[PDB]
Amino acid sequence: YPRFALEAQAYGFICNSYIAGLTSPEFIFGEMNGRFDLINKALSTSST
Amino acid sequence: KIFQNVEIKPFLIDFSNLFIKNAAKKLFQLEEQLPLVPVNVVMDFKGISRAAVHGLSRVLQDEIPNYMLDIKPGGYKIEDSTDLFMTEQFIRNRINFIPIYAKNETLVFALRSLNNSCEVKTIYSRDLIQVAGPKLKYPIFNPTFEIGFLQPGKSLIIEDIYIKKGIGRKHAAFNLAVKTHFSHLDIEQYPTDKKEYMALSGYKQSSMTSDPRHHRLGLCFPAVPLPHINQAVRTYLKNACRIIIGRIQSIQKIYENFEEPQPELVLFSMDEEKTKAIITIKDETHTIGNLLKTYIYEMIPDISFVGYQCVPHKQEMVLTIIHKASQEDLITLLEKSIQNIIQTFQILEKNVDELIA
């Protein structure tokens, strides 16, 4: 995405469903949120 | 005439295909059919409960005695088998699952493969030399199996390959029949191609209410000689019948000894003149239990309770029967149900003998 992009897709808006498949930028944004689940799950043991 | 309209069809190689023709002719010099071929048998049953048909199917699948090829302990000669990849476990797993149609338990084979070439040599099933027992006038297994492969300069020597008997439930190598069809001919079906009905089974009656008594069952046998197909399949069917009868007769020896304290039969006298019978038999499957429940239920329409609970982790079948009669009357009804099962499978025997010429 270009610098100072205005479209909502550039900021994590995934327009597609799982049954229809995601594109490369949508999968990267999904991995950004998916990695947080793995990180917070690890912290949910030690920090607790 | 419970069992009518049987049709038998072998599974044969189509030599009209050039690729298959050339491959077979240059591999095994094969230009005609193999000595042993699979056979699909479709059977129509009328006026019989689905419990009996399904029990016959189960017995033909993995409760009928059957023969395999096994290696005696010490048969795999470590002193001579120099191959590093054809381990004993792999080779014996290959050998156990070769479908055989044996005549006696005396035949003993041997596999002596020497690789004097510079390329990997494939050990086929035609390299099994019979070393003990009467000489075979007809092969007992197909010569086109792939037992293994040897690296250059390696060897594989195996002795004491004998024929072992067992039931398919204990080990899958004794499995006999593979399922190919099962349907009820007295229940209508929806067209399931439509998107309105593709989520349903298809039958127009729920299994919670339906009681079909006109079935079609089609089973495939993996190895039957070409010139005696009708002789083999018939035998198989007949065999199954005897097995079921035999097992049922075991229960018939329990009810006959209800006066003496017997571990496998327990009788209680409940309230309101109700009697309870618990029959616990070890190493029994859903076949005998389902047959017993179905025939007791048919014999006693107003029975208080009947169940055939077969427990996986207990390896046993517990049949509970609660009925508002006395102990003697309950035992009489149970014996009548057992006799009904016996006569039904005797009629199946007779129909099998009558149909397949």
Partner: protein, 223 residues
């Protein structure tokens, strides 16, 4: 003698030379069962007795050399199995030359590597399960049809009415499946659906609780 035998019997070079000797029958196909058979195998493979290996100084000079010397110049491209045999024999011969630091070695190594790469191409041809592509019938190649989202600038009439207010689609309009059922249509709120709608009705369209227009009739507004 014991330490020398233990060292050499665990050398993969010894096993490879022994395999080559087994192929043409210089040593028995079975591994030795007695010390005499082991000594004979050592003498045939290494080429020197273990006693005399400790006396003299070389080691690689007299290791087995295959008996059949095929013509490897047909490796210059009943033929394919013979090609495999030639590949195996030349691999052994070149490995033995590498051990002995033979002159004119790197060029022959490169030539045989090219030959074995061609043979590997053939072997990979033999090792294909197959492949399939679901072709688009309209085209003649791999299907490109997808159910992905495609952006499209909808008219502003879909979000705002003719008075500039936003739409609030919150009235459910239900129409009778059969004609005889009356009334023909019922307009209910989400709270009243369970209390006024039965299976004799079907959801036709939504309605805005501000401008009172059907969602399917939103295009009749003047943009």
């Amino acid at each position: 003698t014991k330490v020398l035998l233990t060292e050499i019997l665990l050398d993969p070079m010894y096993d490879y030379a022994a395999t080559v000797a087994r192929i043409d029958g210089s040593i028995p196909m079975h591994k030795p069962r007695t010390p005499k058979e082991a000594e004979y195998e050592f003498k045939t493979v290494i080429g020197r007795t273990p006693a005399e290996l400790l006396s003299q100084k070389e080691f690689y000079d007299k290791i087995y050399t295959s008996k059949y010397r095929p013509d490897f110049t047909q490796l210059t491209r009943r033929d394919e199995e013979k090609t495999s045999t030639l590949i195996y024999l030349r691999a052994y011969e070149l490995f033995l030359k590498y051990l002995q630091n033979a002159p004119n070695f790197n060029s022959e190594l490169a030539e045989f590597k090219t030959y074995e790469n061609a043979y590997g191409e053939q072997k990979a041809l033999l090792a294909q399960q197959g492949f399939y592509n679901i072709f688009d019938p309209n085209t003649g190649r791999a299907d490109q049809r997808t159910r992905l989202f495609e952006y499209k600038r909808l008219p502003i009439s879909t979000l705002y009415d003719e008075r500039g207010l936003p739409h609030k689609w919150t009235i459910y309009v239900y129409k009778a499946v059969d004609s005889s059922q009356k009334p023909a249509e019922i307009e209910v709120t989400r709270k009243d659906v369970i209390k006024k709608i039965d299976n004799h009705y079907a959801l036709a369209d939504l309605r805005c609780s501000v401008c009172h227009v059907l969602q399917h009739e939103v295009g009749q507004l003047n943009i």
